[PDB]
From a paper:
The thioredoxin BC3987 found in B. cereus ATCC 14579 is conserved among all the members of the B. cereus group, including B. anthracis, B. mycoides, B. pseudomycoides, B. thuringiensis and B. weihenstephanensis. The BC3987 protein has a C-P-P-C active site motif that differs from what is typically observed for Trxs and Grxs.
In the other chain, residues 3–76 are observed, with lacking density at the side chain atoms of Asn76. The crystal structure of the T8A mutant resembles the wild type structure and the C-P-P-C motifs in these structures superimpose with a RMSD value of 0.053. The pH-titration curves for wild type and T8A BC3987 in Figure 1 are similar in the pH interval 6.5–9, indicating that the nucleophilic Cys12 pKa value is not affected by the T8A mutation. The efficiency of thioredoxin insulin reduction is measured in this assay, and from the curves in Figure 2 it can be concluded that the wild type BC3987 has a different reactivity towards the substrate compared to the T8A mutant. The lag-time before any precipitated insulin is observed is much longer for the T8A mutant, and the slope of the curve after the lag-period is slightly steeper for the wild type enzyme.
Author numbering:
A (entry chain A): 3 to 76
B (entry chain B): 1 to 78
The structure:
């Protein structure tokens, strides 16, 4: 239900994950570097060019925006 | 006071998030551990009127707790 799209050497990705963990959010994570299917979903399903991208109930939070995770997750 | 002060402690994920945010933005801050540094703890509580970490002081202005957008604004970094 919550999906995190991340890639190597991505400091904002690590930060977003720590925020989700601290909030005990139940997410699944994908690597758009290793995983071409995840990459295609990032571009074609979510119309996003960058990581981190977080999808919450199909709402797309693209790039490094810690305050919106707070908005949409509670 | 240093221009940018970060008050933190161990086992404080919001503190880690704030410090990493500041690092990613290449902010020139000084940090203090209020568990290990009793003087820093006293400044947090008695000078800055804040009861928890993270607390960031930016040119004298106290930002208590996890306030990323307010940090961004005060640091003139966005």
């Amino acid at each position: 239900k919550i999906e995190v799209y991340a890639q190597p050497d991505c400091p904002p990705c690590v930060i977003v994950k720590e925020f989700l963990k601290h909030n005990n959010v139940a997410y699944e994570e994908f690597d758009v570097k290793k995983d071409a299917a995840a990459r295609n979903r990032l571009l074609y399903d979510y119309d996003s060019y960058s990581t981190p991208t977080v999808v919450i109930d199909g709402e797309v939070v693209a790039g490094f925006q810690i305050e919106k995770l707070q908005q949409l997750l509670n």
